[PDB]
Structure formats: structure tokens, C-alpha cells
Amino acid sequence: SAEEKHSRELEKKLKEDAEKDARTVKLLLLGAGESGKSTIVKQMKIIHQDGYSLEECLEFIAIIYGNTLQSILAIVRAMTTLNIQYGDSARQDDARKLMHMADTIEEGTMPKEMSDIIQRLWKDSGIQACFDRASEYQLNDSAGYYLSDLERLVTPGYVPTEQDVLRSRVKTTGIIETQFSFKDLNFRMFDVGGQRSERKKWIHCFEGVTAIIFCVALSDYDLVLAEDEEMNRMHESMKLFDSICNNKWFTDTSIILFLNKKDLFEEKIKKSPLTICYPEYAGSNTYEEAGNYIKVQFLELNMRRDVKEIYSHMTCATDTQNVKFVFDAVTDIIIKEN
Amino acid sequence: LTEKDKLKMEVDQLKKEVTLERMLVSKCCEEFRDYVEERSGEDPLVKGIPEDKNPFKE
Amino acid sequence: SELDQLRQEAEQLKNQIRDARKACADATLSQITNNIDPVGRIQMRTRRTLRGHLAKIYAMHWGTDSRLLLSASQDGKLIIWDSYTTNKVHAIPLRSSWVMTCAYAPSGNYVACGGLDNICSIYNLKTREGNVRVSRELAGHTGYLSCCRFLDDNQIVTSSGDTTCALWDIETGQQTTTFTGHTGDVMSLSLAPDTRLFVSGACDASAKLWDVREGMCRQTFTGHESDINAICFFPNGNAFATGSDDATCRLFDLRADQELMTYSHDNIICGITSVSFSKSGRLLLAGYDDFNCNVWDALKADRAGVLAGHDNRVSCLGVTDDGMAVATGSWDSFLKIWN
Numbered sequence: 243s244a245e246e247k248h249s250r251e252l253e254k255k256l257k258e259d260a261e262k263d264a265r266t267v268k269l270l271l272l273g274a275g276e277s278g279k280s281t282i283v284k285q286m287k288i289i290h291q292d293g294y295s296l297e298e299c300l301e302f303i304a305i306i307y308g309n310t311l312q313s314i315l316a317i318v319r320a321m322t323t324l325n326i327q328y329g330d331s332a333r334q335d336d337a338r339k340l341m342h343m344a345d346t347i348e349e350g351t352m353p354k355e356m357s358d359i360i361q362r363l364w365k366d367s368g369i370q371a372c373f374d375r376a377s378e379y380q381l382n383d384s385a386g387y388y389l390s391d392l393e394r395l396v397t398p399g400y401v402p403t404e405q406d407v408l409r410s411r412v413k414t415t416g417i418i419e420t421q422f423s424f425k426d427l428n429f430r431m432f433d434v435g436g437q438r439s440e441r442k443k444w445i446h447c448f449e450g451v452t453a454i455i456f457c458v459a460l461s462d463y464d465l466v467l468a469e470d471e472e473m474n475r476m477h478e479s480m481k482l483f484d485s486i487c488n489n490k491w492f493t494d495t496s497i498i499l500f501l502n503k504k505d506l507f508e509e510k511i512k513k514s515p516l517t518i519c520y521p522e523y524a525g526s527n528t529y530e531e532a533g534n535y536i537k538v539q540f541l542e543l544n545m546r547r548d549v550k551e552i553y554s555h556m557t558c559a560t561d562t563q564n565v566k567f568v569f570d571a572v573t574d575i576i577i578k579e580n
Numbered sequence: 581l582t583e584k585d586k587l588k589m590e591v592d593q594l595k596k597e598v599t600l601e602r603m604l605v606s607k608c609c610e611e612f613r614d615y616v617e618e619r620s621g622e623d624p625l626v627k628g629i630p631e632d633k634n635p636f637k638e
Numbered sequence: 639s640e641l642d643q644l645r646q647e648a649e650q651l652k653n654q655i656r657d658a659r660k661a662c663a664d665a666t667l668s669q670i671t672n673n674i675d676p677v678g679r680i681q682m683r684t685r686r687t688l689r690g691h692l693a694k695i696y697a698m699h700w701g702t703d704s705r706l707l708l709s710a711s712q713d714g715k716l717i718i719w720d721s722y723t724t725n726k727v728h729a730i731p732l733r734s735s736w737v738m739t740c741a742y743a744p745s746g747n748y749v750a751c752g753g754l755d756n757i758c759s760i761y762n763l764k765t766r767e768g769n770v771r772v773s774r775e776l777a778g779h780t781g782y783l784s785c786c787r788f789l790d791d792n793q794i795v796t797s798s799g800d801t802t803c804a805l806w807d808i809e810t811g812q813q814t815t816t817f818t819g820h821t822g823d824v825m826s827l828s829l830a831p832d833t834r835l836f837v838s839g840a841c842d843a844s845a846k847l848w849d850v851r852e853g854m855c856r857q858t859f860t861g862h863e864s865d866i867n868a869i870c871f872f873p874n875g876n877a878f879a880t881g882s883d884d885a886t887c888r889l890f891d892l893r894a895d896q897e898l899m900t901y902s903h904d905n906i907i908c909g910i911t912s913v914s915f916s917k918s919g920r921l922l923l924a925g926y927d928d929f930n931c932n933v934w935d936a937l938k939a940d941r942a943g944v945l946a947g948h949d950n951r952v953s954c955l956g957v958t959d960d961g962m963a964v965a966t967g968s969w970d971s972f973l974k975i976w977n
């Protein structure tokens with residue numbers, strides 16, 4: 243029969259999908275906002291999928307300009323909130339103009355007049371003093387990155403580099419999945435992204451994934467939530483991990499901890515005392531001790547019956563070689579364990 | 581804002597609902613019952629289906 | 639104070655709603671139906687086991703011809719089956735495999751689905767065979783798509799984890815109306831037979847009645863202890879049933895603005911995932927986390943039967959328009975037709 247034949251056709255295709263699914267590694271990325279999940283996903287494209295096309299990089303210019311403006315306005319508004327005086331009075335007029343322009347120009351654009359003001363502001367000592375006190379307000383991680391190289395970004399013929407792309411941040415909703423081949427296997431990595439809803443209603447969807455990569459921003463140890471300036475970001479991240487690690491749907495799941503932003507952490511640890519996060523901390527505020535302390539705080543949240551080890555890695559998600567290296571280590575254990 | 585405004589709208593919905601003209605349970609129930617009783621006798625899942633009229637027979 | 643005085647006026651208005659509710663509570667359905675003969679032990683047999691999905695099935699919906707139905711699985715496939723012959727009509731590869739719902743257009747011309755991608759995708763069946771043409775992607779929700787139902791070929795209502803429901807103009811992909819009010823993820827919705835009203839169930843443990851043309855909430859129904867995961871309109875459009883994580887299903891009457899009956903049993907302790915009335919409305923069938931579908935006597939609240947056959951949660955179910963069969967979907971990757 244025609245219908246019967248068609249059904250047989252569909253079935254032979256379904257049979258392929260099953261064979262393929264059998265040889266596929268599923269990786270669920272989890273972690274608080276700004277922990278490094280989107281960046282890891284961008285790295286999979288750069289490392290395992292031939293990076294970004296010319297046009298794709300060009301599409302990132304608007305995002306990069308948005309991020310850059312957003313960063314400077316944050317510092318500028320903090321001048322008032324923190325009561326920090328400009329190094330040069332003339333900067334006041336620049337700030338006033340920049341703020342008017344901000345809600346006048348099209349989103350994602352960077353006029354010469356704007357960049358000129360931004361470069362002048364960036365050079366001011368008051369602005370620099372405010373920038374160093376980022377912990378006290380909400381500032382993008384890439385603020386210094388883009389602002390320090392603003393001239394390049396606005397030079398005609400400018401084409402975003404992979405690092406420029408990696409440093410970007412775009413607001414999106416919905417789950418994001420990336421698929422690729424590596425080590426003669428298929429990989430499916432997903433990040434739930436902008437998911438405004440209760441986790442309990444969807445977390446079961448991931449029962450059975452090959453492994454969970456939990457991202458923690460080491461540098462969040464002295465930051466607070468944008469929406470709740472009373473919630474320490476690291477405490478929030480710990481609650482998230484506690485909830486996930488001890489969840490009934492992941493009793494025997496392989497979990498790997500990515501202690502991310504080690505580069506920002508390494509610099510911050512020389513400025514901020516870890517005790518801001520852990521009052522009881524009695525170690526030395528060094529990259530070694532402090533980072534190990536944070537690692538232990540997270541690992542100790544694991545109350546699972548199956549005591550299988552939760553591997554930890556100090557990472558810099560924006561560093562392609564670091565990620566390529568860690569991911570290579572990670573995948574080896576997975577393949578040689580699952 | 582937010583907390584107050586979500587709440588201000590909460591109370592704003594109640595005010596509307598509080599003016600609901602409710603019907604008697606018994607009338608509702610009786611009408612519910614009569615509806616079912618008029619057709620349960622022909623409900624395939626209540627009565628079962630003679631094999632010859634069952635499209636899901638082998 | 640402002641907040642507190644608001645907390646006050648709200649509660650006062652609430653204790654005022656119940657009293658009004660009591661005022662109309664002169665009797666109970668079970669009293670009114672006590673003189674009715676029991677339906678006896680309902681014994682349905684598995685007539686078909688639809689095998690094809692590679693993973694958990696999360697949703698299904700019967701075609702209005704009571705023969706074709708579509709199922710959604712996180713294997714990233716939307717399959718359209720001929721339940722009579724068991725022949726697969728289509729096996730649509732979705733852009734996102736994290737689907738949580740699917741609908742069949744009354745016309746049979748389109749199907750729709752969505753999930754963690756927060757989008758409701760429309761597919762044109764009257765175009766491609768096997769796979770099919772994605773005709774529209776309705777973007778707008780900021781939380782997962784939990785349910786969707788076509789009113790016709792150009793309109794569809796959706797419920798989301800972002801706590802809202804919406805009406806969409808398909809040809810435009812625009813949201814013609816947004817339904818705000820629930821304070822918890824909306825898990826399910828059901829259209830009144832005349833498609834002029836609809837009800838939704840949510841994690842705020844309440845159900846709400848909505849006017850589709852006027853976009854506002856007419857009534858809100860409370861009673862459940864936990865999240866309402868399923869909801870369904872009763873055939874006469876004067877009532878509907880809910881299924882909740884609290885191990886109970888409930889029957890609510892619109893006109894009386896309250897529940898008429900609770901369906902439970904001390905030995906049934908898990909959550910409900912779906913609900914559906916049989917053609918006459920005599921039976922209320924529900925899917926449970928414990929792997930069964932329990933059949934309830936809608937009028938007498940008696941557990942009349944059980945549909946045991948799945949080896950994992952029954953995630954969805956549906957009764958055909960002609961009332962001849964019930965289909966159950968399960969996390970065990972199979973769908974079964976019972977008669």
C-alpha cells in the first residue's frame with residue numbers, strides 16, 4: 243500500500259536517528275546568569291564548527307556597540323551614585339551629552355561624536371576610579387575590554403575578531419543548542435538561556451543527559467544581584483548548585499564544575515577579601531587558597547548517595563585555548579566512563 | 581511599583597469578581613446531571629463497543 | 639503601609655468571595671446524583687500501541703476525524719499517525735527538540751507545537767509528505783510553551799511558563815491578545831466549545847476563565863493544593879475539570895463559580911498530568927505520574943477503572959470527538975489506544 247510504503251519510508255529514517263542518538267553525547271550547561279554559559283557555547287562553534295563567517299562577525303558590530311555604550315553609561319551613572327568627582331570638570335558636559343545621545347541614537351550604533359566623548363571619559367581619573375569600584379554597581383564583564391580598545395572598534399573597515407565576538411553579550415529567550423562532531427562522536431550541548439518560569443516544571447526534561455557542566459564565576463564573590471542588591475551572587479550560585487546537584491532527576495549524573503573567569507578572579511583577589519563572601523574564611527586572599535576555598539564550598543554541597551566525583555576545572559571561557567584544553571580533558575573522562 | 585502594582589491589580593481583579601452573580605449549586609448540578617444522563621447511554625467508553633462497530637479492532 | 643493596606647483589601651475581598659460562594663452552596667453534586675446507578679468497573683483494552691518515538695512523549699492531540707492524531711516527543715519529532723492502521727503519516731523534524739506540546743488544527747490542515755524554545759511553530763500539512771513545511775514561528779513568550787490550541791486556521795491560543803496566555807494571528811505572527819493574571823507558570827488551557835471563552839490552569843494552583851474577544855479574566859477558581867497541570871472543558875461549556883500535583887482532579891462549575899466535586903483516593907498519591915471527559919461527560923479520565931490512567935465516574939466520584947500498560951509516566955491523553963477511543967502518551971516512548 244502507498245500509505246504503508248510511506249510509513250516504512252519514515253521508519254527507516256527514524257531508525258537512523260536512533261542509531262545516531264545512541265552515539266551522541268548530551269551536555270547540559272547550567273549556572274547563574276553571567277557565569278560563562280553562552281561563551282562556552284560560542285567556543286564550541288569556534289573550536290568544533292569552523293567559527294564565524296564574515297557576515298556573522300559583521301552582525302556582531304551592533305551588539306558590541308550596544309555593550310560598549312551600556313558599559314560606559316553604567317560607569318557614568320555610578321559617578322553620581324557613588325559621589326565620585328570627575329578628574330576634569332569638562333567631562334561633566336561630556337557625560338550630560340552622552341546620556342542625551344544614548345536615548346536619541348538608534349540601538350547598536352556608535353557615532354564619531356559618541357566614541358569621542360567615550361574615549362575622553364575613559365581617560366578621566368574619576369571615571370577610572372569609578373570603574374575600579376565596579377563591585378558596587380552593575381557593570382558588564384567586558385566593560386574594560388571594549389572601552390580600552392574603542393578606537394579599533396570604530397575605525398572604518400572594522401571587522402569583529404573572535405575575541406570581540408566572545409566578549410559580547412546578547413539578550414535572548416529560549417533554549418540554545420549547538421551540535422557538532424568530535425572524537426568520532428556526535429555532541430549536543432544546550433543552555434536553557436532566557437527561561438522565565440519555574441525550573442521544577444522543566445528540569446526533568448534533562449533526566450538522562452550524559453553530563454552537566456556547571457559554570458561558576460569565581461569573580462562574583464563580592465558582587466550582588468541586579469534585581470536583588472541584597473543577594474550575594476556567589477551565595478545565589480551556591481543555592482543553584484545545591485538545588486541541581488541534589489535533585490532527584492540527577493542522582494547518578496556526571497557533573498563537572500567550571501570555576502570560570504579565573505583571569506578576572508586572579509586580579510580581583512588582590513583587591514577584594516574573600517570574606518566579603520565567606521565571613522568565616524581564614525585563609526590567605528590568594529588566587530590559590532581562595533580559589534580552592536570556593537571550590538570546596540561548592541563540592542561540599544553534594545549530598546548524593548552516588549559519591550561519584552564531581553570534577554572541577556579553573557577556566558577562562560573567553561580564552562579559546564583554555565576551553566579547547568579543558569573540553570578535551572572533560573570529554574576523555576566522559577567517553578572513558580559513559 | 582511591581583509588588584504594589586501586581587497587588588493593586590490583584591485587588592483590582594477581586595473587586596470585579598466580587599460582583600459575580602452566582603447561580604445555585606443544585607441548579608448547576610441538576611443541569612450537569614441531566615446533560616450526562618441524556619447521553620451516557622450512547623457513550624462508547626461507558627457502554628463498551630460491539631466488536632463489529634469498533635474501528636480499533638484487529 | 640501602602641503595600642500592607644493592599645495586602646489587607648485583597649484578603650478582605652477574598653473572604654468576601656467565599657461567603658458569596660457558600661451563599662449559593664445549597665447542596666452537592668453527589669447528593670443530586672445519589673439515585674444514579676454506578677457505571678460499574680470500566681474495563682478498556684489496549685487496541686493499539688503506537689511505536690516510533692525514540693524518547694519520552696510529552697503531548698498528543700486527536701484530529702477531529704477521530705483517526706489521525708499527532709504526538710510530540712523530545713526525540714525532536716512530531717509524528718502524525720493513522721491510529722486505525724498504525725501507519726505513520728508524517729514524522730516532522732523540529733528545529734528545537736525540546737517540545738512540550740502539540741495541537742492538531744480542526745481543519746486538519748495544520749499542526750502546531752513548541753517547548754523550551756518559547757516559540758509556537760505552525761506546520762502546513764497540506765503541503766509536504768513525511769516531513770512538512772514550517773509555516774510560522776510565533777515569537778513573544780519569555781518562558782516555555784506549555785500548551786496551544788487552534789480556534790481555526792489563522793488563530794491559536796497558547797499558555798506559557800512566563801505566567802501568561804496569548805491569542806495569535808497566524809498570517810501575521812502577531813499576538814492579538816495577551817492574558818495576564820496568573821501568578822505562576824500556566825500549564826494548560828482549554829477552549830469552550832464555542833471558542834468564545836477559555837480556561838487555563840497554573841502553578842499558582844488556580845484556574846481562570848477568559849474572554850477571548852475582551853481579553854480579560856472573568857473568573858478565578860481556587861481549591862487545589864498544588865500546581866494544576868491539566869485542564870479540560872466539559873462538553874456543555876458550563877464547567878471544566880482540572881488535574882493537579884495534589885493527587886486530585888476537580889470539577890468546577892462556571893455559573894456557581896466553584897467546584898462541584900473532587901476525584902481522589904488515599905492510595906493514589908502521585909501527580910496528575912492530563913485530564914479528559916468521555917463523550918457524554920459521565921467519565922473523567924486522567925493520566926498520573928505512577929504510570930496509569932484512572933477512569934473516574936464524573937457524577938458519582940467513583941474510581942471506575944484503570945488503564946495500566948505504560949511502564950513510565952502517562953504524560954498526556956485524549957478522547958476522540960466521536961467518543962470511540964482514548965489515547966494515552968507516555969514517557970516510555972509509546973502511545974496506546976484503549977477501547
Ligand SMILES: Nc1nc2c(ncn2[C@@H]2O[C@H](COP(=O)(O)OP(=O)(O)O)[C@@H](O)[C@H]2O)c(=O)[nH]1
Binds near residue numbers: 278409410561
Ligand atoms: N574575562 C572573562 N570574561 C568572561 C569569561 N567567561 C565569560 N566572560 C564574559 O562574561 C560575560 C557573561 O558570560 P556569558 O557567557 O554571557 O554568561 P551566561 O549568562 O552564563 O550565558 C560575557 O561578556 C562574557 O564574554 C571569562 O573567563 N573571563
